[PDB]
Design a protein around this ligand. Structure first.
Ligand SMILES: CC1=N/C(=C\c2cc(F)c(O)c(F)c2)C(=O)N1C
Length: 105
């Protein structure tokens, strides 16, 4: 219920790069929210991505997102709602790299 809206996002990946940008969550049904993402990686690559947060019966928040601006790499992971104003992003890219970030509202 707290996800919908815009979040400021900072991330770091296993290649030692960092990223900054935003994620925007749109409620769709009781079991899914749509996500769109914008930002920039520390190597200069622009970030444009879109996906879905799927909610399982145990309330786990699974995220799948594809990034056309990064050669269509895909990211799959889980969001952990630490508080009403903070969430943690743990994921792995389709290249096999860890991607960790923090969402702040
Ligand atoms: C800041 C930010 N980085 C994102 C994705 C992202 C960042 C990275 F550093 C990656 O290597 C990568 F494969 C994806 C994203 O969606 N946002 C909002």
């Amino acid at each position: 219920q707290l996800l919908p809206g815009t979040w400021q996002v900072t991330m770091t990946n296993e290649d030692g790069q960092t990223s900054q940008g935003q994620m925007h969550f749109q409620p769709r049904s009781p079991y899914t929210l749509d996500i769109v993402a914008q930002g920039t990686i520390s190597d200069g690559r622009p970030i444009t991505g879109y996906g879905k947060v799927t909610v399982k019966t145990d309330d786990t928040l699974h995220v799948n997102i594809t990034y056309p601006s990064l050669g269509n790499i895909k990211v799959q992971g889980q969001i952990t709602m630490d508080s009403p104003t903070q969430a943690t992003w743990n994921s792995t890219t389709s290249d096999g790299k860890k991607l960790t970030g923090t969402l702040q509202r």
